[PDB]
């Protein structure tokens, strides 16, 4: 069922009306009831007692339909000649099959010498009695082929030389490679090659919703089927693998690049797009970077570092801060320092830093958490806004808040605490009380306390930051003498060590 009929004598319901030499007394046309219980048109001859038989039968012109190799199926029966009255001898058990290529579709006469012999066809089996009821499959079936054919069409001829023979059906056909979709590429119906040692190169076009990555090709063999598939057509961006054509990604699925893998679900914090989307769009408040990959989720905007430590010099100012609380989901974290000059004067409104402010580490977008500003005018009050910048923050709206600190230029550093005192003394905790230093030289913001064990090797100093003038120690072993040192910290500068208080647990 993979072969196109160029002629089937069984399809003719009126008459074949093929030309025959002689026209009477040789091949003759008669109907039969066939295997399928259907009346068909047949040709027969049985001049077994007559010598020197040369009975020619010739079909109408058959079009090739451009197929260079054509197959000829002949189903025939041979009546056993010794079943006929008088006929004593050896039976003729063969006939000869010929062909003639012609553009002319109305050849008038059988020109014997112009026909080319395909083969002598032999009856595998003969019969002596006609079949009455149900058709038993004892007919002979012989297939031959001819080609390469050059002309528009051709004639088949049969030569009988004295057999008792009936051609039950003649079927002329070509094979063919069927229309199949393999490796996500369409292949059309192609006819078989003229020679068995010759292969047909078949290159078919890919699906409309797919791009050709590798050149697709198939080899249509003589048997009527492809051999080795070479070159695969990968599905386009926003289309997955399917039985037929590349099916688009469903609502809530994306495909950025042409990959063999199926459509992946939208990343966290991303709005669902319509059927057949390239990338899942980000909802309000979230934005994706240009350099950042489509696989990465939408980011969140960064947070400003809550704590800010500031130390001042005669003309320069040093700033330090910790890592941000909410990263957002990006490794590229930068910091932008903005000069304001809003510290000078009581009102809120001020003039911007129009003058050339020089800061040695980086101007804008520093990766390090420490910066140093130089060439600042003395006796004038200043304020700096350390604004955290992410890779997405440019595409994202400007972050609501940025942690800033107001500083002074000419004003010094704070002095040391006159005396410290222990309030409560227990085996687990020791309370500490202290007053503010004699000379503040600025607004007090923090108090740092240091702890170090005596009678043993110098252990790493314990750091406890408290803005309040009172703090309590926690988790200490009994009978361990400890030295406590307090230090006042301001935005204006660095303080000095307090009174060394040696208290035994």
């Amino acid at each position: 069922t993979n072969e196109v009929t160029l002629l089937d004598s069984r399809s003719v319901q009126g008459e074949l009306g093929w030309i025959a030499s002689p026209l009477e007394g040789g091949w003759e046309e008669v109907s039969i009831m066939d295997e399928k219980n259907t009346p068909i048109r047949t040709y027969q001859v049985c001049n077994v007692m007559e010598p020197s038989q040369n009975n020619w039968l010739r079909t109408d012109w058959i079009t090739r339909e451009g197929a260079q190799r054509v197959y000829i199926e002949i189903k025939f029966t041979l009546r056993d000649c010794n079943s006929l009255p008088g006929v004593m001898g050896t039976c003729k058990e063969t006939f000869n099959l010929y062909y003639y290529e012609s553009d002319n579709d109305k050849e008038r006469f059988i020109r014997e010498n112009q026909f080319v012999k395909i083969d002598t066809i032999a009856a595998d089996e003969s019969f002596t009695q006609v079949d009455i009821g149900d058709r038993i499959m004892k007919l002979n079936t012989e297939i031959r082929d001819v080609g390469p054919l050059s002309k528009k069409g051709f004639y088949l001829a049969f030569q009988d030389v004295g057999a008792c023979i009936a051609l039950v059906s003649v079927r002329v056909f070509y094979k063919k490679c069927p229309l199949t979709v393999r490796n996500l590429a369409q292949f059309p119906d192609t006819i078989t090659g003229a020679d068995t040692s010759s292969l047909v190169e078949v290159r078919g076009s890919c699906v409309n919703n797919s791009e050709e990555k590798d050149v697709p090709k198939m080899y249509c063999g003589a048997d009527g089927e492809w051999l080795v598939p070479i070159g695969n057509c990968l599905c386009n961006a926003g289309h997955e693998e399917r039985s037929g054509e590349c099916q688009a990604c469903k609502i809530g699925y994306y495909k950025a690049l042409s990959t063999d893998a199926t459509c992946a679900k939208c990343p966290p914090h991303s709005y669902s797009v319509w059927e057949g989307a390239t990338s899942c769009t980000c909802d309000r408040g979230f934005f994706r970077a240009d350099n950042d990959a489509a696989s990465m989720p939408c980011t969140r905007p960064p947070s400003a570092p809550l704590n800010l430590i500031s130390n001042v010099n005669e003309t320069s100012v040093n700033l330090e801060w910790s890592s941000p609380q909410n990263t957002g989901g990006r490794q590229d974290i930068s910091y932008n320092v903005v000069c304001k000059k809003c510290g000078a004067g009581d009102p809120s409104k001020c003039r911007p830093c129009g003058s050339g402010v020089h800061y040695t580490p980086q101007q804008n977008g520093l990766k390090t958490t420490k910066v140093s500003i130089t060439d600042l005018l003395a006796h004038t009050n200043y304020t700096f806004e350390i604004w955290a910048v992410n890779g997405v923050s440019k595409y994202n709206p400007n972050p609501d808040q940025s942690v800033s600190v107001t500083v002074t230029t000419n004003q010094a550093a704070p002095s040391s605490i006159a005396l410290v005192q222990a309030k409560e003394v227990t085996r687990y905790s020791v309370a500490l009380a202290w007053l503010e230093p004699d000379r503040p030289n600025g607004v007090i913001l923090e108090y740092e306390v240091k702890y170090y064990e005596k009678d043993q090797n110098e252990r790493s100093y314990r750091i406890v930051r408290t803005a309040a003038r009172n703090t309590d120690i926690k988790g200490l072993n009994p009978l361990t003498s400890y030295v406590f040192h307090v230090r006042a910290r301001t935005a204006a500068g660095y303080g000095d060590f307090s009174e060394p208080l040696e208290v035994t647990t």
């Binding site: 003759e28 008669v30 295997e35 047949t42 027969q44 001859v45 049985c46 009455i132 009821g133 009936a166």
Partner: protein, 141 residues
């Protein structure tokens, strides 16, 4: 020679004296036709008459009676199409049953249907009796 046998009531060669007797020669062809009778041309009848034609032993032919698993020659199913069947009185045939024509014997081509779609499969004298639709064949010695 031998003329086409048209198989409908319109024939009338059936309602004839002796009763439609053909004497075919060895080598003769024969056609049995069931003409359209839908777009009604010549030779067709008032309306399509559904028949099955059997070749019969002559003894049974007289009795107007097909044997079991009869020798069905032609089946006029289709009122749309012209149907035909051709015999040649010869040793070869696209027939696979191994039937044979004794010489000096009588054979009948009979139709035991009443000529209706519902009477089609009837195997015992229908129109064969009714309209006398049979044909005797006496084949050259």
């Amino acid at each position: 020679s031998l003329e086409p046998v048209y198989w409908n009531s319109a024939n009338k060669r059936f309602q004839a004296e002796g009763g439609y007797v053909l004497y075919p020669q060895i080598g003769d062809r024969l056609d049995l036709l069931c003409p359209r009778a839908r777009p009604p041309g010549p030779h067709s009848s008032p309306s399509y008459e559904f028949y099955k034609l059997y070749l019969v032993e002559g003894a049974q032919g007289r009795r107007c009676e097909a044997p079991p698993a009869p020798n069905l020659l032609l089946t006029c199913d289709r009122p749309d199409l012209d149907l035909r069947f051709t015999i040649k009185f010869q040793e070869y045939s696209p027939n696979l049953w191994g039937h044979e024509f004794r010489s000096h014997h009588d054979y009948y081509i009979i139709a035991t249907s009443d000529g209706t779609r519902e009477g089609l499969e009837s195997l015992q004298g229908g129109v064969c009796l009714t309209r006398g639709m049979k044909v005797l064949l006496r084949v050259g010695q």
